[PDB]
Design a binder for this molecule. Structure first.
Ligand SMILES: C[As](C)(=O)[O-]
Ligand SMILES: C[As](C)(=O)[O-]
Ligand SMILES: C[As](C)(=O)[O-]
Ligand SMILES: C[As](C)(=O)[O-]
Ligand SMILES: [Cl-]
Ligand SMILES: [Zn+2]
Ligand SMILES: [Zn+2]
Ligand SMILES: [Zn+2]
Ligand SMILES: [Zn+2]
Lengths: 125, 128, 127, 124
């Protein structure tokens, strides 16, 4: 991982570890913008489709007029570490920030940043 | 009429949606008040898979800050649409996660008014 | 009191959920009535990404049958939970796609009653 | 594809072509259960997360106590043909029917059945 990738992991980790343990708010995300800012958020769990942390990040970035996001990561509570984006988040990320990379674990459990398109092969169009 | 703090929510959400490019994806801003005095903002993320409304982005932003219970929320539309009542999905999430919250809606006169979330979902479904 | 058709909806949704294995993923059934008199049923698909409630599965089932306008809907929970009021998300989709629809809910005395969808979303969201 | 798989495409195509053209009801899906039954459905578009056709199929199959679904396909209206499942559907399919395959188009535009895990690499 690059310096900025490690930094996103640290920011997301600090975010989730800094709030009370909760079944409603259990994952944090951090993303980097092309204009030199970092946005965080936590999920809102709900059966009607409450947003993942990544989507909260996207809305937070949009509220700040941070156009292009270039890298994103999700970190689970209780020291779970890096979580790969769920399929819903992958679709929203592909559609709204097609240039973005997401930090996921490789087969060795080692963090790596992968282009969003690679996380949705034979993508829906 | 509205309390001072309630008016501040309308101001803040109006500033937010007037501070971002006009967009079909990012078209509504929201602001909520915590019992701790802080205000949290958010903009929606439109998507057919169920991208969050602005209110849900606010909820996640407040949660990220370990906010004290939220007491009031408002949504403000782009293109100068003004106050928008929360959609049914947002109403359900607010009822379930912040049952004490009020939402700012327009009365009969088009005048801002704070209403308990329960009033916005009569015979409310209870997520157990 | 409910019409014959409305009672039939309750019976059909109840039969549907009672007929399947108890499950955390599939835990509510719904039945709706179309203006032409047909009945469509469905069960929910629970998922954190926003899997559909039974009502929405019923909407897609009716749509697959070119059912047109739906006039009444009800949801019934598993394990003899009985009538459940539609959640806020279902209310919004129902109002938007079938504005003429009523939902069966329990009134303040616990008695089934058919209510216009608009009444279930006061000061509703309009674009 | 196998003949059972080809039938899914036929059934989903018939379903979407049988209904009035609509912006709300625009995709049909068909799935095969382990015992050979076929279940169909159409989407319900809504900004709050109305279900894709696949999820309607999942609830339809569940209503019939179908158990495991082994194959699924989505067909777009207006002769759009096979549509790869979106990321949301991929996630639900993975979680509720991990043994399932989805029919997608290959490089030559020809139908191919792919395991759901391959459609969500490094899957959550
Ligand atoms: C890694 As996730 C559950 O926030 O899509
Ligand atoms: C007023 As709304 C579309 O953010 O629920
Ligand atoms: C009564 As319901 C959880 O199907 O909206
Ligand atoms: C191919 As789709 C829009 O039903 O996931
Ligand atoms: Cl959703
Ligand atoms: Zn996600
Ligand atoms: Zn909403
Ligand atoms: Zn519902
Ligand atoms: Zn889909």
């Amino acid at each position: 991982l690059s310096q900025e990738e490690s930094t996103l992991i640290e920011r997301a980790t600090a975010t989730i570890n800094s709030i009370p343990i909760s079944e409603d708010y259990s994952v944090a995300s951090a993303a980097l913008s092309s204009d030199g800012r970092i946005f965080t958020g936590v999920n809102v769990y709900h059966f009607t489709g409450g947003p993942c942390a990544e989507l909260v990040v996207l809305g937070t970035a949009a509220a700040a007029a941070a156009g292009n996001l270039t890298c994103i990561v999700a970190i689970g509570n209780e020291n779970r570490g890096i979580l790969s984006p769920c399929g819903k988040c992958r679709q929203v990320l592909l559609d709204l920030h097609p240039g973005i990379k997401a930090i996921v674990k490789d087969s060795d459990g080692q963090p790596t940043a992968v282009g969003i398109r690679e996380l949705l092969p034979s993508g829906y169009v």
